[PDB]
mmCIF file of C-alpha atoms in Angstrom:
data_model
loop_
_atom_site.group_PDB
_atom_site.id
_atom_site.type_symbol
_atom_site.label_atom_id
_atom_site.label_comp_id
_atom_site.label_asym_id
_atom_site.label_seq_id
_atom_site.Cartn_x
_atom_site.Cartn_y
_atom_site.Cartn_z
ATOM 1 C CA UNK K 1 54.792 120.068 53.356
ATOM 2 C CA UNK K 2 53.042 120.596 50.008
ATOM 3 C CA UNK K 3 51.683 117.405 48.443
ATOM 4 C CA UNK K 4 51.443 116.267 44.836
ATOM 5 C CA UNK K 5 47.879 116.901 43.665
ATOM 6 C CA UNK K 6 45.497 116.578 40.741
ATOM 7 C CA UNK K 7 42.945 119.398 40.658
ATOM 8 C CA UNK K 8 39.810 119.741 38.542
ATOM 9 C CA UNK K 9 37.283 122.577 38.276
ATOM 10 C CA UNK K 10 33.597 121.887 38.926
ATOM 11 C CA UNK K 11 31.676 121.324 35.692
ATOM 12 C CA UNK K 12 28.904 123.487 37.160
ATOM 13 C CA UNK K 13 29.246 126.371 39.639
ATOM 14 C CA UNK K 14 27.063 125.753 42.697
ATOM 15 C CA UNK K 15 28.758 127.775 45.432
ATOM 16 C CA UNK K 16 29.987 124.628 47.203
ATOM 17 C CA UNK K 17 33.229 124.279 49.165
ATOM 18 C CA UNK K 18 35.951 122.405 47.264
ATOM 19 C CA UNK K 19 36.461 118.728 48.103
ATOM 20 C CA UNK K 20 39.827 117.203 48.967
ATOM 21 C CA UNK K 21 40.065 113.413 48.590
ATOM 22 C CA UNK K 22 42.683 111.553 50.642
ATOM 23 C CA UNK K 23 43.612 107.910 49.952
ATOM 24 C CA UNK K 24 44.747 105.219 52.388
ATOM 25 C CA UNK K 25 47.881 103.156 53.032
ATOM 26 C CA UNK K 26 49.672 101.957 49.887
ATOM 27 C CA UNK K 27 47.253 103.985 47.781
ATOM 28 C CA UNK K 28 47.646 107.008 45.507
ATOM 29 C CA UNK K 29 45.589 109.997 44.350
ATOM 30 C CA UNK K 30 43.897 107.852 41.707
ATOM 31 C CA UNK K 31 42.276 105.546 44.287
ATOM 32 C CA UNK K 32 39.372 107.848 45.168
ATOM 33 C CA UNK K 33 39.005 108.853 41.532
ATOM 34 C CA UNK K 34 35.678 107.036 41.290
ATOM 35 C CA UNK K 35 34.290 109.530 43.818
ATOM 36 C CA UNK K 36 35.996 112.499 42.158
ATOM 37 C CA UNK K 37 34.483 111.715 38.762
ATOM 38 C CA UNK K 38 31.001 112.172 40.214
ATOM 39 C CA UNK K 39 31.617 114.980 42.703
ATOM 40 C CA UNK K 40 33.345 117.147 40.088
ATOM 41 C CA UNK K 41 29.951 117.671 38.445
ATOM 42 C CA UNK K 42 29.327 120.322 41.100
ATOM 43 C CA UNK K 43 32.501 120.736 43.198
ATOM 44 C CA UNK K 44 36.098 121.737 42.550
ATOM 45 C CA UNK K 45 38.088 118.594 43.343
ATOM 46 C CA UNK K 46 41.567 118.150 44.791
ATOM 47 C CA UNK K 47 43.047 114.644 44.761
ATOM 48 C CA UNK K 48 46.223 114.305 46.810
ATOM 49 C CA UNK K 49 49.084 111.851 47.149
ATOM 50 C CA UNK K 50 49.760 111.373 50.858
ATOM 51 C CA UNK K 51 53.398 111.819 51.877
ATOM 52 C CA UNK K 52 55.490 108.745 51.027
ATOM 53 C CA UNK K 53 52.900 107.701 48.429
ATOM 54 C CA UNK K 54 52.458 108.209 44.686
ATOM 55 C CA UNK K 55 54.586 111.117 43.490
ATOM 56 C CA UNK K 56 54.434 113.118 46.712
ATOM 57 C CA UNK K 57 57.678 113.892 48.582
ATOM 58 C CA UNK K 58 59.336 111.331 50.852
ATOM 59 C CA UNK K 59 59.960 111.907 54.566
ATOM 60 C CA UNK K 60 61.087 109.505 57.309
ATOM 61 C CA UNK K 61 58.357 110.924 59.570
ATOM 62 C CA UNK K 62 54.865 109.453 59.418
ATOM 63 C CA UNK K 63 52.296 110.553 62.008
ATOM 64 C CA UNK K 64 48.860 112.109 61.793
ATOM 65 C CA UNK K 65 49.620 115.618 62.989
ATOM 66 C CA UNK K 66 52.250 115.723 60.225
ATOM 67 C CA UNK K 67 49.859 114.380 57.604
ATOM 68 C CA UNK K 68 47.204 116.849 58.751
ATOM 69 C CA UNK K 69 49.667 119.734 58.395
ATOM 70 C CA UNK K 70 50.477 118.490 54.889
ATOM 71 C CA UNK K 71 46.800 119.041 54.083
ATOM 72 C CA UNK K 72 46.974 122.565 55.496
ATOM 73 C CA UNK K 73 50.155 123.309 53.530
ATOM 74 C CA UNK K 74 48.450 122.029 50.393
ATOM 75 C CA UNK K 75 45.382 124.208 50.975
ATOM 76 C CA UNK K 76 47.640 127.218 51.567
ATOM 77 C CA UNK K 77 49.479 126.535 48.305
ATOM 78 C CA UNK K 78 46.172 126.473 46.428
ATOM 79 C CA UNK K 79 44.859 129.493 48.326
ATOM 80 C CA UNK K 80 41.829 127.619 49.660
ATOM 81 C CA UNK K 81 40.397 128.952 52.925
ATOM 82 C CA UNK K 82 38.175 125.984 53.764
ATOM 83 C CA UNK K 83 37.363 122.633 52.184
ATOM 84 C CA UNK K 84 35.312 119.485 52.649
ATOM 85 C CA UNK K 85 37.519 116.439 53.241
ATOM 86 C CA UNK K 86 36.848 112.838 52.263
ATOM 87 C CA UNK K 87 39.397 110.273 53.374
ATOM 88 C CA UNK K 88 39.715 106.506 53.235
ATOM 89 C CA UNK K 89 41.384 104.596 56.067
ATOM 90 C CA UNK K 90 44.814 106.186 56.710
ATOM 91 C CA UNK K 91 43.595 109.190 54.722
ATOM 92 C CA UNK K 92 40.493 109.275 56.878
ATOM 93 C CA UNK K 93 42.711 109.355 59.955
ATOM 94 C CA UNK K 94 44.703 112.256 58.505
ATOM 95 C CA UNK K 95 41.459 114.139 57.878
ATOM 96 C CA UNK K 96 40.134 113.433 61.364
ATOM 97 C CA UNK K 97 43.463 114.633 62.779
ATOM 98 C CA UNK K 98 43.035 117.863 60.803
ATOM 99 C CA UNK K 99 39.931 118.726 62.844
ATOM 100 C CA UNK K 100 42.161 119.062 65.894
ATOM 101 C CA UNK K 101 44.977 120.905 64.111
ATOM 102 C CA UNK K 102 43.056 123.457 62.034
ATOM 103 C CA UNK K 103 39.259 123.090 62.405
ATOM 104 C CA UNK K 104 38.623 126.377 60.602
ATOM 105 C CA UNK K 105 40.078 124.893 57.417
ATOM 106 C CA UNK K 106 37.466 122.110 57.316
ATOM 107 C CA UNK K 107 33.836 122.361 56.187
ATOM 108 C CA UNK K 108 32.372 118.856 56.148
ATOM 109 C CA UNK K 109 34.091 115.523 56.770
ATOM 110 C CA UNK K 110 33.698 111.992 55.443
ATOM 111 C CA UNK K 111 35.717 109.068 56.792
ATOM 112 C CA UNK K 112 35.517 105.844 54.793
ATOM 113 C CA UNK K 113 35.861 102.534 56.689
ATOM 114 C CA UNK K 114 38.013 103.876 59.490
ATOM 115 C CA UNK K 115 37.732 104.784 63.172
ATOM 116 C CA UNK K 116 39.869 107.215 65.224
ATOM 117 C CA UNK K 117 41.500 104.419 67.219
ATOM 118 C CA UNK K 118 44.765 102.499 67.579
ATOM 119 C CA UNK K 119 43.934 99.032 66.218
ATOM 120 C CA UNK K 120 46.894 97.466 68.060
ATOM 121 C CA UNK K 121 47.451 94.743 65.442
ATOM 122 C CA UNK K 122 49.595 93.979 62.409
ATOM 123 C CA UNK K 123 47.352 93.490 59.378
ATOM 124 C CA UNK K 124 49.769 93.988 56.494
ATOM 125 C CA UNK K 125 52.662 91.598 57.073
ATOM 126 C CA UNK K 126 51.848 89.401 54.067
ATOM 127 C CA UNK K 127 51.334 92.495 51.899
ATOM 128 C CA UNK K 128 54.776 93.792 52.912
ATOM 129 C CA UNK K 129 56.177 90.317 52.189
ATOM 130 C CA UNK K 130 54.614 90.366 48.727
ATOM 131 C CA UNK K 131 55.857 93.891 48.048
ATOM 132 C CA UNK K 132 59.386 92.882 49.070
ATOM 133 C CA UNK K 133 59.250 89.693 46.988
ATOM 134 C CA UNK K 134 58.468 91.740 43.887
ATOM 135 C CA UNK K 135 61.359 94.116 44.599
ATOM 136 C CA UNK K 136 63.755 91.196 45.049
ATOM 137 C CA UNK K 137 62.674 89.462 41.836
ATOM 138 C CA UNK K 138 63.386 90.619 38.286
ATOM 139 C CA UNK K 139 59.760 91.611 37.670
ATOM 140 C CA UNK K 140 59.388 94.779 35.586
ATOM 141 C CA UNK K 141 55.772 94.681 34.383
ATOM 142 C CA UNK K 142 52.553 94.549 36.408
ATOM 143 C CA UNK K 143 51.774 91.054 35.121
ATOM 144 C CA UNK K 144 55.160 89.736 36.226
ATOM 145 C CA UNK K 145 54.713 91.433 39.593
ATOM 146 C CA UNK K 146 51.189 90.052 39.978
ATOM 147 C CA UNK K 147 52.465 86.497 39.474
ATOM 148 C CA UNK K 148 54.817 86.878 42.442
ATOM 149 C CA UNK K 149 52.235 88.615 44.610
ATOM 150 C CA UNK K 150 49.700 85.820 44.074
ATOM 151 C CA UNK K 151 52.186 83.534 45.830
ATOM 152 C CA UNK K 152 51.656 85.628 48.973
ATOM 153 C CA UNK K 153 48.126 86.996 48.652
ATOM 154 C CA UNK K 154 44.885 85.407 47.496
ATOM 155 C CA UNK K 155 42.756 88.553 47.299
ATOM 156 C CA UNK K 156 43.032 89.599 43.649
ATOM 157 C CA UNK K 157 41.458 92.972 44.390
ATOM 158 C CA UNK K 158 44.186 93.830 46.886
ATOM 159 C CA UNK K 159 46.867 92.713 44.444
ATOM 160 C CA UNK K 160 45.504 94.950 41.679
ATOM 161 C CA UNK K 161 45.133 97.889 44.081
ATOM 162 C CA UNK K 162 48.787 97.627 45.116
ATOM 163 C CA UNK K 163 49.922 97.228 41.504
ATOM 164 C CA UNK K 164 48.530 100.659 40.641
ATOM 165 C CA UNK K 165 51.645 101.858 42.473
ATOM 166 C CA UNK K 166 54.035 99.579 40.581
ATOM 167 C CA UNK K 167 55.513 101.645 37.754
ATOM 168 C CA UNK K 168 58.745 101.133 35.801
ATOM 169 C CA UNK K 169 59.621 98.187 38.031
ATOM 170 C CA UNK K 170 59.459 100.413 41.107
ATOM 171 C CA UNK K 171 56.955 100.941 43.909
ATOM 172 C CA UNK K 172 55.598 104.484 44.096
ATOM 173 C CA UNK K 173 55.227 104.349 47.881
ATOM 174 C CA UNK K 174 58.164 104.529 50.324
ATOM 175 C CA UNK K 175 58.280 100.922 51.559
ATOM 176 C CA UNK K 176 61.098 101.308 54.125
ATOM 177 C CA UNK K 177 59.330 104.229 55.802
ATOM 178 C CA UNK K 178 55.874 102.650 55.695
ATOM 179 C CA UNK K 179 57.297 99.561 57.399
ATOM 180 C CA UNK K 180 59.278 101.547 59.969
ATOM 181 C CA UNK K 181 56.360 103.843 60.810
ATOM 182 C CA UNK K 182 53.656 101.165 60.568
ATOM 183 C CA UNK K 183 52.775 101.232 64.302
ATOM 184 C CA UNK K 184 51.986 104.941 64.000
ATOM 185 C CA UNK K 185 49.851 104.444 60.893
ATOM 186 C CA UNK K 186 47.642 101.701 62.374
ATOM 187 C CA UNK K 187 47.952 103.636 65.618
ATOM 188 C CA UNK K 188 46.273 106.865 66.671
ATOM 189 C CA UNK K 189 46.639 110.016 68.752
ATOM 190 C CA UNK K 190 43.420 110.888 70.601
ATOM 191 C CA UNK K 191 41.976 114.261 69.619
ATOM 192 C CA UNK K 192 39.543 116.737 71.221
ATOM 193 C CA UNK K 193 35.876 116.461 70.287
ATOM 194 C CA UNK K 194 34.874 118.037 66.962
ATOM 195 C CA UNK K 195 31.365 119.385 67.542
ATOM 196 C CA UNK K 196 30.159 119.190 63.935
ATOM 197 C CA UNK K 197 28.287 116.616 61.827
ATOM 198 C CA UNK K 198 30.695 114.013 60.424
ATOM 199 C CA UNK K 199 29.930 111.104 58.090
ATOM 200 C CA UNK K 200 31.471 107.669 58.627
ATOM 201 C CA UNK K 201 31.002 105.058 55.888
ATOM 202 C CA UNK K 202 31.904 101.568 57.173
ATOM 203 C CA UNK K 203 32.010 98.421 55.078
ATOM 204 C CA UNK K 204 29.509 95.826 56.263
ATOM 205 C CA UNK K 205 32.118 93.091 55.870
ATOM 206 C CA UNK K 206 34.934 95.004 57.556
ATOM 207 C CA UNK K 207 36.054 95.224 61.215
ATOM 208 C CA UNK K 208 37.448 98.760 60.951
ATOM 209 C CA UNK K 209 34.341 100.450 62.396
ATOM 210 C CA UNK K 210 32.827 97.760 64.615
ATOM 211 C CA UNK K 211 31.056 98.286 67.943
ATOM 212 C CA UNK K 212 34.189 98.010 70.091
ATOM 213 C CA UNK K 213 35.428 101.330 68.684
ATOM 214 C CA UNK K 214 32.120 103.175 69.058
ATOM 215 C CA UNK K 215 32.853 104.765 72.452
ATOM 216 C CA UNK K 216 36.165 106.248 71.288
ATOM 217 C CA UNK K 217 34.679 107.274 67.958
ATOM 218 C CA UNK K 218 31.845 109.249 69.568
ATOM 219 C CA UNK K 219 34.175 110.744 72.177
ATOM 220 C CA UNK K 220 36.071 112.430 69.340
ATOM 221 C CA UNK K 221 33.174 112.890 66.896
ATOM 222 C CA UNK K 222 30.065 113.401 69.065
ATOM 223 C CA UNK K 223 27.870 114.152 66.039
ATOM 224 C CA UNK K 224 29.163 111.233 64.001
ATOM 225 C CA UNK K 225 26.651 109.718 61.571
ATOM 226 C CA UNK K 226 27.247 106.204 60.239
ATOM 227 C CA UNK K 227 26.098 104.680 56.969
ATOM 228 C CA UNK K 228 27.161 101.045 56.730
ATOM 229 C CA UNK K 229 27.395 99.661 53.197
ATOM 230 C CA UNK K 230 26.192 96.058 53.235
ATOM 231 C CA UNK K 231 28.337 93.458 51.507
ATOM 232 C CA UNK K 232 31.396 95.691 51.245
ATOM 233 C CA UNK K 233 34.952 95.211 52.449
ATOM 234 C CA UNK K 234 37.551 97.776 53.530
ATOM 235 C CA UNK K 235 37.845 99.487 50.124
ATOM 236 C CA UNK K 236 34.128 100.319 50.136
ATOM 237 C CA UNK K 237 34.391 102.905 47.360
ATOM 238 C CA UNK K 238 35.995 100.334 45.057
ATOM 239 C CA UNK K 239 33.213 97.781 45.575
ATOM 240 C CA UNK K 240 30.074 99.901 45.970
ATOM 241 C CA UNK K 241 30.914 103.387 44.657
ATOM 242 C CA UNK K 242 27.257 104.210 43.944
ATOM 243 C CA UNK K 243 26.200 103.360 47.491
ATOM 244 C CA UNK K 244 29.107 105.417 48.839
ATOM 245 C CA UNK K 245 28.197 108.399 46.655
ATOM 246 C CA UNK K 246 24.538 108.259 47.685
ATOM 247 C CA UNK K 247 25.620 108.459 51.327
ATOM 248 C CA UNK K 248 28.099 111.230 50.620
ATOM 249 C CA UNK K 249 25.619 113.424 48.749
ATOM 250 C CA UNK K 250 22.857 112.954 51.320
ATOM 251 C CA UNK K 251 25.308 114.280 53.919
ATOM 252 C CA UNK K 252 26.568 117.119 51.710
ATOM 253 C CA UNK K 253 23.057 118.285 50.781
ATOM 254 C CA UNK K 254 22.305 118.265 54.521
ATOM 255 C CA UNK K 255 18.532 118.489 54.069
#
């Protein structure tokens, strides 16, 4: 279905395809804003809220073909024939899934710290526990919520990231659905090879795009190009936005 979006016209017309930014699990359209603020200098930008996140509609279903179709529905609503997609983690998986669903609607592709594979692990149990603790408490403000979350998590950056979605004493994302569909989110549905250049930006201090996923990654993205950002964790764009943008533009300029 159609997603909630924030669109902005390029500050300078350069005949470039528009860019759609897609955030990851527990995120919102503001998360890739750091990239949008730079890319808007010469590209029309579309920032989306993935289903069950931010102010986008809620649905009990959460799988990549569905999320990819959401992107198509959103492009159709904006009357955009083709666009370049940049997605982080879960959003990167939705974008990769789109290459199999509607390849003609995609120009270039950037996947930030993510691989097209089923990770077969639970990596958010403590985060879910923190989220639930906040909901159970009487916390109404971000500060009050943070206090409770610090009792479960010790990564301040993660706490602050999650709190962006804590408004009016309520979580913007659909917790029940994210928990129920978790296996599908960390999971993956193998797709046919996309025979076009694709940029992968892994974090040097993250296991999301390590060597054990290389075979599967190349099987689906034969012309994959990787640009590892040293000293960066999973939210690479939050830690080293400049490094991420340099990689993105080198790929977009395709010299």
